């Protein structure tokens, strides 16, 4: 699996899956990604993120 935020491979037996109100599902590889996501930041705009680069 791939982190729906940063884009790196989620180490098996790790991570969290956030279930949005509408039923949407977001697989996070870490707290860092969830936290940056909660700050309303979009992965594309963060250089360290595999998505952006």
């Amino acid at each position: 699996r791939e982190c729906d935020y940063c884009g790196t491979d989620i180490e098996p037996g790790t991570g969290t899956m956030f279930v949005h109100k509408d039923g949407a599902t977001t697989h996070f590889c870490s707290s860092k990604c969830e936290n940056n996501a909660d700050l309303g930041r979009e992965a594309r705009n963060l250089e360290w993120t595999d998505t952006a680069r």
Partner: protein, 337 residues
């Protein structure tokens, strides 16, 4: 009428004092059923990772599906059964009769023992067989030691000596089985005793925490609400009633917490191997890199990294062995991050 409540902590692991030996000492051994064999082994705790497994349990709805399981990595290099001690049945319990030693000694065993220079193996052996004829021979155990030198991550070179019982068939056959093991050089391995999938009892001396209060040590409550601001936060209500006019040893008090011997029952051996398959990226924190004979114990194991742990075939298993579990994946992700 003031609600009931179980007491704080167990009275079964006392006194809660510092352990005499950092090397655990099993106070019980498995039964004599199968073929003659050594009833235990030992290693050094490395750290933890998780593994992905295939459900072995035939009674689980998830049988056959992938399952993530936590695992403690323990470096289990070969040991040396340097001697064979025999016990005799006396009216005051079992007592050490004699011992049969060897010629080949590990280069650095003298860091602990006063290695034998002049010993008579034959005479001792005879005495043991004579006691067996007399029907007074108690049990048979081997004096064993580890080779910390084989483990890079472990600083000590001074071997850890521990007696391990030999059970199995008839006393005559396991006597011989023991003698043979000792003869060669006493060299044996985790393979010789255990098979992945079996349940083991792991004993070890817990992580030391020095002195700690009743709250941490016994799990008593903290003062609540208004009581928590008056000058008392983590002190119990009282040391006991007016009468009896003395403090009972059963009341939770401050003291040494940690560094005690513990024997964790029914620990599944997920896998026994050799190499660097389980080592974590960047090295196990506060330990090092594993590249050799190891064991993967399901779950936690008492003690800090680098500590000597002991294995023993489960004396009271609840389940039937489900041999050689299928390991689909072993995590190597860094334990830093």
């Amino acid at each position: 009428p003031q609600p009931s409540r179980p007491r704080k902590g167990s009275l079964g692991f006392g006194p809660r004092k510092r352990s005499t030996s950092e090397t655990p000492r099993f106070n019980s051994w498995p039964s004599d059923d199968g073929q003659p064999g050594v009833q235990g082994f030992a290693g050094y705790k490395a750290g933890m990772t998780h593994v992905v497994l295939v459900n072995d349990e035939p009674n689980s709805p998830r049988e056959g599906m992938e399952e993530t399981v936590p695992v403690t990595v323990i470096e289990t290099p070969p040991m040396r059964a340097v001697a064979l001690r025999a016990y005799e049945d006396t009216p005051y319990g079992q007592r050490p009769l004699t011992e049969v030693w060897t010629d080949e000694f590990h280069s650095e065993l003298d860091r602990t023992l006063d290695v034998p220079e002049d010993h008579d193996p034959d005479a001792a052996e005879e005495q043991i067989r004579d006691a067996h004829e007399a029907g007074d021979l108690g049990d048979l155990r081997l004096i064993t030691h580890t080779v910390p030198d084989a483990v890079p991550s472990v600083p000590k070179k001074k071997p850890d000596v521990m007696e391990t019982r030999v059970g199995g068939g008839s006393v005559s056959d396991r006597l011989d089985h023991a003698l043979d093991i000792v003869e060669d050089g006493g060299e044996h391995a985790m393979n010789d005793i255990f098979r992945a999938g079996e349940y083991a009892d792991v004993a070890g001396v817990t992580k030391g925490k020095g002195t700690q209060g009743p709250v941490k040590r016994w799990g008593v409550q903290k003062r609540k609400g208004k009581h928590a601001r008056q000058g008392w936060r983590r002190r119990i209500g009282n040391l006991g009633p007016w009468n009896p006019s003395r403090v009972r040893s059963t009341v939770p008090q401050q003291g040494q917490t940690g560094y005690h011997q513990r024997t964790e029952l029914n620990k599944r051996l997920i896998d026994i191997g050799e190499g660097d398959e389980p080592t974590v990226d960047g090295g196990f924190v506060n330990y090092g890199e594993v590249d050799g004979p190891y064991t993967l114990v399901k779950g936690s194991v008492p003690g800090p990294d680098k500590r000597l742990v002991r294995f023993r075939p489960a004396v009271r298993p609840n389940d039937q062995p489900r041999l050689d579990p299928e390991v689909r994946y072993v995590s190597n992700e860094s334990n830093q991050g």
